[PDB]
Structure 1
Amino acid sequence: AGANVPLITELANDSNVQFLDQDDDDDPDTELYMTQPFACGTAFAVSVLDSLMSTSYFNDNALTLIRTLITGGATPELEQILAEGAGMRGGYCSPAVLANRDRCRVAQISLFDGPLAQFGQGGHYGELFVYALRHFGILCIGLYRFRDTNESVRSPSSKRYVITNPPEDFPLLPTDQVYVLTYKQ
C-alpha cells in the first residue's frame, strides 16, 4: 500500500534517474526526457529548463504564456507591489477586482463515471474533444494513460505515461485520464 503513493522527486544530477525505477532497463547515453521516470511525471531536473533560453529568443510570447500557465497570475503590478519591501498586502476586495477570479485553470478529468464517460468504451479522441468543447467549454490537451497494456488485470506496476495531443483517430480506454483547461472555476 506504500507503492501507490504519488511522489515527485527533484534531482540535482540528471544521470541518477536510472536509480529511481526498477522495472525499467537502464542505459548510459539515453537522454533524460526519454527515460521512464520522466515519461511518467515522477522525476524532474532543472537541466530541462536550459532550453528555455533559446525559445525565448526565437519566440517572444513563449515566456509570457508559460508564466501564465504555471503561475496562476503574478501580474507585473504584483511584482511592483512586492518590490516595495513591505511584503504581500491586501484584504476585502472591490467587486471590480474580484472579476479576476474566473481565469482558466489546468485540471485532470477521468473517463470512468462522468457525464462524458461514454467515450471510454470504443470512443475516439476527436469525438471527445469536439463534444467537450461544444458542450462544456473545455479544451483537451492530452492523455495520461496506464503504462501496462493489460489494464483488465492491472499489472502491479500501476504507472501512467503522458501523450501530448493524440491524433483524431486515437482509440480511448475507460481508465484513461484527460488534461483539460477548465473555465469558470
Structure 2
Amino acid sequence: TFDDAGANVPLITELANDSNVQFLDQDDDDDPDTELYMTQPFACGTAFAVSVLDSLMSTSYFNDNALTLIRTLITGGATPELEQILAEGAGMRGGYCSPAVLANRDRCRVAQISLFDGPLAQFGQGGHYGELFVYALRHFGILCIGLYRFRDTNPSSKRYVITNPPEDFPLLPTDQVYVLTYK
C-alpha cells in the first residue's frame, strides 16, 4: 500500500518454468492443459518465458531478414559492427561523434499512443481501427500494428494485446495503440 497503488503497478516477470504462470494472477481460471501463450498473464504482457523464443530457429532458416528486423527493433539498433567492436574485448568505446554517424540517431521505435486525447481521439469515440490506420499513416507517418485493451469494461487495470485487428474492428476511448514512429 502506498498512501500519502498495489495491483495497479506495472510488472513483467521472467518465468523459468512456464507452468508457474498459474500463480502470477487471480480471477484467471488456471488449467495446466493450457500452453503459455493462451494464459491471461502472457496475453496481458506481464509474464515472459524463454520457451516462446524456440520457434526463432525456424524463422531463421525460412526468413533470415525477419530475424534481422526483430534484432534491430528489440535491441534498439545493435548492428554487426557493434558486436565486432565488443568482440575486440575493449568494451563499448565511444565519445562525441560525427554529425555524420549521428544521422542514425533517427530510427523507428515502437511506441504507444493513447486514443484518449489528442488528434487521434476522434477515432476513439466509435471509430473503427481501419480509419485510424489510414489517418495516421497519412497525416503522421505512423503505422498502427495493434491495440492494448482493458480486459474489463462496464473493473481491473489489466489490459491485453490485439495484434493487427480487422479493418472494421470497433475502437474504445480507453484503448492504447502500438505504433512504429520515426520521431
* CA displacement at 1:50 relative to structure 2: 1.0
**CA drift at 1:43:** 0.5
Deviations 1:42-77 (A, max 9, x none): 001001111111121122222111101101111111
Percent identical residues: 100
Q: Could you tell me how far 1:11 is from its partner in structure 2?
A: 0.6
> For residues 55 and 87 of structure 1, what CA distance do their matches in structure 2 show?
31
Q: 1:22-33, aligned counterparts within 5 Å?
A: 22-33=26-37
SS at match of 1:82: helix
**CA distance in 1: counterparts of 2:156 and 2:114, whole angstroms:** 20
Q: Distance in 2 between matches of 1:28 and 1:129?
A: 38
Aligned counterparts, 1:2-151, within 5 A: 2-150=6-154
Q: Quote how far apart the aligned CAs of 1:38 are.
A: 0.3
CA displacement 1:4-61 (0-9 Å, x = unmatched) = 0001001110001111111110112111000000000000100111111112112222
Count of aligned residue pairs for this structure pair = 179
SS of match in other structure, 1:69: helix
Mapped to 1, the partners of 2:17 and 2:115 lie a distance apart of 37
How far the C-alpha of 1:80 sits from its partner, in A, is 1.3
The TM-score normalised by the length of structure 2 is 0.95
Q: Could you list the per-position Cα deviations for residues 107-158 of structure 1 after superposition, in whole angstroms to 9, with x for gaps in the alignment? A: 00001111111111111111111000010100000000000132xxxxx422
- Alignment RMSD (CA, Å): 0.9
Over 2 Å off, 4+ runs: none
Q: Which has the higher helix share?
A: 2
Q: CA deviation at 1:89?
A: 0.8
SS at match of 1:161: strand
* Cα drift, residue 99 of structure 1: 0.4
Give SS of 1:106's match.
Answer: strand
Q: 1 or 2 for the larger relative contact order (CA 8 Å, sep ≥6)?
A: 1
